[PDB]
């Protein structure tokens, strides 16, 4: 098992992210535009699917 606080710390780096709908890039949680250039800085973002 993993201590609850440590699991929260690790989740920050690989669980709480936004995903662009055009190039599947990882984005910060509060982002509004993709940073990559090949998708044209699109603003069609969705949250990263949770584990359940």
């Amino acid at each position: 098992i993993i201590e609850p606080s440590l699991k929260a710390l690790a989740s920050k780096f690989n669980c709480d992210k936004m995903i662009c709908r055009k190039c599947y890039a990882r984005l910060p949680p509060r982002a509004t535009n993709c940073r990559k250039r090949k998708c044209g800085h699109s603003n069609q973002l969705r949250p990263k699917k949770k584990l359940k």
Binding site: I2, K7, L9, A10, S11, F13, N14, C15, K50, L51
Partner: peptide, 13 residues
């Protein structure tokens, strides 16, 4: 591997 399940690693805190 599924990185939502395998949280192994070293992280800054």
């Amino acid at each position: 591997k599924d990185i939502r399940k395998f949280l192994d690693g070293i992280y800054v805190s």
